[PDB]
Amino acid sequence: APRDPDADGTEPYVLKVTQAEFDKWEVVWACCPTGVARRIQGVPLLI
Amino acid sequence: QYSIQQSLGNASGVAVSPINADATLSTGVALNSSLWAGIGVFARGKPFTVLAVTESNYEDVLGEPLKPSSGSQFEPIRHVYEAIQQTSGYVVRAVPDDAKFPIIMFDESGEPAYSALPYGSEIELDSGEAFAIYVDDGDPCISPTRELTIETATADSAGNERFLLKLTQTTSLGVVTTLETHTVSLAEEAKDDMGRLCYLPTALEARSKYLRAVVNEELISTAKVTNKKSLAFTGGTNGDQSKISTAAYLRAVKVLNNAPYMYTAVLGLGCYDNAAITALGKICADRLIDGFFDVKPTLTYAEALPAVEDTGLLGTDYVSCSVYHYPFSCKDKWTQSRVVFGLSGVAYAAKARGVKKNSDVGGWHYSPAGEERAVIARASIQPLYPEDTPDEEAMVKGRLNKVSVGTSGQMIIDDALTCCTQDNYLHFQHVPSLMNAISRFFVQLARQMKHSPDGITAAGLTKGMTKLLDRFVASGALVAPRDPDADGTEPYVLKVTQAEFDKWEVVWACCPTGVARRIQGVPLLI
Amino acid sequence: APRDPDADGTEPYVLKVTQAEFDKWEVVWACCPTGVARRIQGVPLLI
Amino acid sequence: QSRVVFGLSGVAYAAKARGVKKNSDVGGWHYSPAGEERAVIARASIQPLYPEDTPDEEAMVKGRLNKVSVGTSGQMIIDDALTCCTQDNYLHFQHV
């Protein structure tokens, strides 16, 4: 799911087809790649 | 394993930040410990130094009690004895200029010589004298006399010759006891059996209470010590302690001012010098420390009132200071004879008894004048001025605390008032103690919170002050305001104002409890 | 938050972008730094 | 093992590093390099060279000098942090 749910929909991918020109034809797809855990940081807190 | 880094960079390795804890911060203050400090004239002690005396070892530090035959010298030791029954304390000894201490000088061959020098002056070594040894304690070697013996010893690897010094005490009858034994070497680089450094000045300054030594640097290389037995210190005398100049008292007060140790109360141990009392009151006001003072008992009832005005304490500048008068006489425990005391220390005893009633808060509520807190236990009391009565109203106007006869035939302090001219709830001693305790705790807690970002320090100060005020309310220090229409039911009201960018203000308002001094009852018929 | 809420908004920072010149371009940011506790003063009051 | 005189440089940097390390991502530049725990000046033993003499605090503030004092636990501590700025326009502080 996108990291910005307010500006972007919850759908992981969004696809649209536009006929546009009579013989030409366009397709657009948008995807949100997953995250890669490269750096991990942890802090201790006392309560 | 391997090291764990902190504050990792831009790639790869992981890190753990240092442990962060701030809501757990707290300040540890006893707030119940009570200690007394004072100055006086004592038979034995180190002049112009702060000495700590406890219930057990006070007699050894202050020496034998002074004889009542001598004038104005038995008062300080007996006042200290009366005041020390509850808690330990700190004393400063004042000495006249005529007093001196003995010194033993050793030549290159080893022939001893004796001399005496005043306390203030520093010793000087002439040509031909290898070193000198003097007594740091300052006790004159009269009556019980102190003697020094020297014995040879073996070397240690490097061949540095060492020797044993033994200090012993002999009574008048002939009883001999071993006080101190030490191993010292003239060589700068010397070692003991356990590895301790063996240098006479260093060793004496490190692990000795009686002797100090000064070695001339010219004759350190060529110096030999032979066997000498029973070397006795020459005559050292103490000057007339009845007459003490005001300058000595001022110097003693100044020395007492700069003391790293903390004391809760200041007591006047039989001091009747006006300048000294004013200085002590200034110290009490500066340190926000309660103080007790005593007018000279020799004055009569009529002359007591002008004496208080003579001392520079009748004003609004000194609030916590209190004064007492006691013209009666009793009998000394040590010597069966008549004596006149000053009512100082008994008030401190009452304050300590009132404080001990609570464990954590401190129990500063009770005034130092009560049915059971103050009893004045003495062998027998004979009034000096019979057929004469004091004026109660005059004493109240002059801020003097009187004494009366209790139900069980025991003399008792029936009032507690401070040296405050105005009647703005400050003449009572109950309120300044609480206010001083609160101020001291606030200063101690705020000292830790210095140089903190805004918001965090606000939360810390608010939490700490609220906890302290809640503890005091639970202990019964604060009561609901006497005017509920104009003032809220909350015993305390606290507010924090940031105001200036770097400055920051805190305000707290409290309602002290009431003290039952006068009770009136009327009968009515229905 | 600013020490003057009547004259300044409650926002800790205010940022604005002005195109101005055709090729030049300006950005302005305003911030309110936190306070440092250097002097603390307290008074006792009796009620 | 001998007596030496140092210059108070690096200890301030140590305090700044300690203040920075309090935060991971942002940086933690909030804290001034003069605090109860940030600056401690740990040394074997300190002997003052000019006893019976006291400095003037107001003169140092006017001259933009940072002094030292004795902490609660008997440790010498830096009790102020100021920069070389003549004006009082919130810039003499090192925090901003």
Numbering used by the authors:
A (entry chain c), C (entry chain h): 482 to 528
B (entry chain b): 3 to 528
D (entry chain h): 338 to 433
Sentences from the paper on this structure:
Phage P1, a temperate phage first discovered in 1951, transfers DNA into a wide range of gram-negative bacterial species by universal transduction and has been used to construct a fine structural genetic map of E. coli.
The tail terminator and tail tube structures did not resolve at high resolution, probably due to the different helical parameters between the sheath and the tail tube in the contracted tail, resulting in the problem of center-alignment. Tail-contraction causes the length of the tail sheath to decrease to 940 Å, and the width of the sheath to increase to 275 Å, and the pore diameter of each sheath ring to increase from 82 Å to 108 Å, resulting in the tail tube’s detachment from the sheath. Remarkably, the “handshake” and β-sheet augmentation mechanisms of the sheath–sheath interaction are still preserved in the contracted states.
